[PDB]
């Protein structure tokens, strides 16, 4: 869908996040590894332990890509088409991990920001993580 409310909540809650998005992107990644130890396969160069500078470093990127993306809500392909190629062709990521990542990505915002994390936003968000996950999943099908 991606209608009015979505944009409101999608943009309106990605601010409550402010400069925290990257520690959040860090926290989400780290969550994945504990709950899904397979997600660790795509990251064997990284030092995967809790406070790691790579995960932190990488969290900042997965913050930015999204923060940018959460902006250009009207063209979600093209802001993310820097990243389709990489995940889809150059990384041969498995489509299933975006389900995994975006879940972790949310749990974190729920935990760090309950008052905001209302079903409606929660709902506008998953509708949007899926949109990203969608585009990334684009380039091999």
């Amino acid at each position: 869908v991606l209608s009015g409310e979505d944009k409101s909540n999608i943009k309106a809650a990605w601010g409550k996040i402010g400069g925290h998005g990257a520690e959040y992107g860090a926290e989400a990644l780290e969550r994945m590894f504990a709950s899904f130890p397979t997600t660790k396969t795509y990251f064997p160069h990284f030092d995967v332990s809790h406070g790691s500078a790579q995960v932190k470093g990488h969290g900042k990127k997965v913050a930015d890509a999204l923060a940018s993306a959460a902006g250009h809500l009207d063209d979600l392909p093209g802001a993310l088409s820097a990243l389709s190629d990489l995940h889809a062709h150059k990384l041969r990521v498995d489509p299933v991990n975006f389900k995994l990542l975006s879940h972790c990505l949310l749990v974190t915002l729920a935990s760090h920001h309950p008052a905001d994390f209302t079903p409606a936003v929660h709902a506008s968000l998953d509708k949007f993580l899926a949109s990203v996950s969608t585009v990334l999943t684009s380039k091999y099908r």
Partner: protein
């Protein structure tokens, strides 16, 4: 499922530290707001118009308690994760025609509610404890299939 003695340790204090009522209702109502196509098994709760009503619906709430109370049955039965749901894998597939993927989906919703309600106390580790916990029940709910 395997949970290290350290792992059932954290399952226990957290689920203790946490009401346990609104989780199910807050868990449930989220499912049909997040994934609305799942309300098709609930048109006798009447008004599932919007997130508001959805959350504020005594039967959404009353079933929510119902789910967890039995979602708790498994927390106190971890290894024996089968027979509990002996019936109940039955309703949810044979008398109510549920899609077993949706057991995960509710599973994953409970996981998010446990971290809404705990904030900083939900470790990626503590989270990973419950993920097996969720998966176990979720898997144990969609087992009747011959």
């Amino acid at each position: 499922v395997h949970l290290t003695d350290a792992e059932k340790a954290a399952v226990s204090c957290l689920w203790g530290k946490v009401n346990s009522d609104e989780v199910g209702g807050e868990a449930l109502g989220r499912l049909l707001v997040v994934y609305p196509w799942t309300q098709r098994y609930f048109d006798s709760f009447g008004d599932l118009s919007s997130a508001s009503a959805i959350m504020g619906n005594a039967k959404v709430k009353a079933h929510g308690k119902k789910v967890i109370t039995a979602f708790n049955d498994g927390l106190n039965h971890l290894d024996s994760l089968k027979g509990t749901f002996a019936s109940l894998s039955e309703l949810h597939c044979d008398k109510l025609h549920v899609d077993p993927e949706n057991f995960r989906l509710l599973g994953n919703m409970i996981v998010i509610v446990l971290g809404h309600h705990l904030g900083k106390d939900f470790t990626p580790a503590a989270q990973a404890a419950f993920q097996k916990v969720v998966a176990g029940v979720a898997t144990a709910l969609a087992h009747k299939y011959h």
